[model samples]
Target: MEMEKEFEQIDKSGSWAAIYQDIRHEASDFPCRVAKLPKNKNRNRYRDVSPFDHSRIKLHQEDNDYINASLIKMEEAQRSYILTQGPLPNTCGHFWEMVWEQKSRGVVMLNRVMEKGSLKCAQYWPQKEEKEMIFEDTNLKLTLISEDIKSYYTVRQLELENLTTQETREILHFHYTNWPDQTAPESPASFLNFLFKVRESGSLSPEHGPVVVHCSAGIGRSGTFCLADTCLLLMDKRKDPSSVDIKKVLLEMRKFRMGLIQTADQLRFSYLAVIEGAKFIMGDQDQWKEL
Candidate 1:
């Protein structure tokens, strides 16, 4: 794939269409790595036998397989992006502008139609800007503005609230965190817990619009989770075996959202998480519908 230094004209011709088709045509071949790292058992001591016993082995394999599938799908998607959109934009802020520009076909003056109180963590959080810009650009009805992150006590706190968007029946809190130290070992349970919480809380009901996720830069965790959601959909439909390419989906997402799936680690983790979750729910068939 060729990387462009700037946003040049993308050769959106025969090859471009064929690229995505070819990727989707291929079978998934992604794989995950498993290992036993040292663990401190006693408050003041350690053990020779790895804490990764038989149970851990099972979990590790599960995580590795899922992550591997997720990355393979992601890589295929990214390749499609390269073919259709060129390199990713430098920043998430830039990405939001691009989305607006594409939607408006020029510089746009958006209106802030909704605000869920003060959820601003940084000067650059896109919740406000996204609400305004999207309203100005798209004909979609503006719906419920979310309560600030600090206000909601749990996922349940964000639910049962009605929004006024067309066909929107549920509320979602787009939460994101970036702790580099959080890797495969520590992440799976918390991530799974969140998924369980969402399902338990009935947040995935068709009445609710798809969750609008974002992070500090609106990439990394945000991208990973969103992309995983898409991948799960692919698995559910049994679309072309390779139709759910993570990279391409993320690239398209980035094209629209900017800096999405920012870091390689984030991308890798997302792939792993989705696969792990899917398998946990479905052994050979796509049963994520249990959600």
Candidate 2:
């Protein structure tokens, strides 16, 4: 109730955009690190999308180490997530390269392949029933083992192999197909369920490398997803859902990646999801235990 009221008040005040702009201004001062590398500029899906220098993920091979990805570690919450832009045609190989190098167990995708009649993301993974898709640029092969289709999301079992080293790793693909660009979900219920489903797989566990999360530009829906997930985790740990400061959490998250929670609507949705998720966590802890 308190959260909802505060959100409503902020919405009515027409100051949400002002707050977002302030954060963006502050974030612009952060070093973009290797994002400025002439060779890396083209790797970014969007001209404006760049990883923060402080937490940017660098590739191993000196020749092709530029990829638009950021490693965000929430030490207070014990969560590590790799936030990145949607893979472009040229960067798909680099995308898989980061996953292989980082040993990420899961990929949480929040955007569709096509949105608003335009290609928002590349078809990075192998299609169902297809034997495998190989990226010649990075010498990476992605094989699809199985796919579990749900109403709002799809889960696929994928095996990522580094052809050069003959190394293989299993990866989980959690694709949320219902979220449209520049908008929130119809409700937080389905989104919360999706988060728990990912959590149940132990892919987001501390023992594993950071889970990779991306949308089109990897900031709007991606940021909302991370912020909501982190806030809920903090709530679970602190035993007080209301104590989590949404703005502060987002500001801190933006320090690692630029333009998180892109719009006022996304910001509003984040709060709503966090409040709804708090109720879900506080009221039905046992319901999710079986998963």
Residues 1-291, candidate 1: write the lDDT tens digits: 011211022233324334434433442322212222222122101121111121111212222211000111233322111001110222223322222222211110111112235222222223442342222312222223444332212221111211224333223433322233234234544555455444455444444322333332234454555566566655556544344555555554443333445444555466566656666545442232332
List model 2 lDDT by residue over 38-80, tens digit each. 8777787787878878788988876878888999889788998
Sliding window of 10 residues with minimal summed lDDT for model 1: 79-88
Candidate 2: where is the Cα deviation over 4 Å? 11-15, 25-28, 285-291
**Model 1: CA > 4 A from native:** 1-153, 156-186, 239-243, 284-291
TM-score of each: 0.39, 0.92
The models' CA-based lDDT, in order, is 0.33, 0.85
Error of 1 at 55 (Å): 45
Best by TM-score: 2
